[PDB]
Amino acid sequence: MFVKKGDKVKVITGKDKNKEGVVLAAFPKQDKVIVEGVNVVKKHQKPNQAAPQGGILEVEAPIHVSNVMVIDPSNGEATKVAFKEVDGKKVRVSKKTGEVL
Template sequence: MHVKKGDKVMVISGKDKGKTGMILEAYPKQSRVLVEGINIVKKHAKPSQVNPQGGILNQEAPIHVSNVMPVDPKSGKPTRVGYTVENGKKVRVAKNSGEVLDK
């Protein structure tokens, strides 16, 4: 996958198109990512010991990785990802500016 946990990404399609957020979790086997504040769904929780009230909760749902693009640290715009080898390590690079995306 071209994105990792902790990356700042922009949604490029779907109901949240244009919004940005940080990746909270990545699910490589399903090719999905959980992005902070994106794809909010209502979950109906029945009462339990942890949540005695129950009710309807708002939470993020995973979206397909093809619907997000990393944000270029230099310009703040979405960018494609390239790979280069620096000091014997493969690092991700923003195609627009050449800036390294890995910390």
Template sequence: MKIKKGDKVQVITGTYKDTVGEVLACFPKEDRIIVEGVNVVKKHMKPTQENPDGGIVEKEAKIHVSNVMIYDEKAKKAGRVGYKFETDKKGNTEKVRVNKKTGAVIKGKK
């Protein structure tokens, strides 16, 4: 899966089309992700010790990874993810993710 936790993505289909948000969680075995503010559902919660009142809670549900594209904030454009190899000053080669439309390197959280 080319989309990682912490990436900025834009939804390209469905009710939330053109919405930009951050990926909160990834589920590679299911090819699904949770995006901040997208696919918000109401869940009925039973009263528990942590939540004694219970009630109705709004939370984000999973969406398929094919419904989003990586988003470049500087260019304000969404694009597909590609890979390229970069060499640093010491001669070390590293494989990095790249936005194919803008050519910008996608920085991962380390």
């Protein structure tokens, strides 16, 4: 998975190159994860309890993890995350000159 709920992210593929954001929800069990301002979709909502009207809304849609990097925050780039045996947990450890997340 290598991606948690709150974890900034770069997008590599799919009409949102280079655009970053914050992961909101994590769906493992189908490998989908939704971010902010990357997958805007227009929903023809019908008049409902919520939103008595029927506006055209704009929310985000899931993206497959093969389109998502992780972030440095110590530095600010993308790292093909590796794992290290730091003290008795496995804290993710960046590649590309040794960061610690």
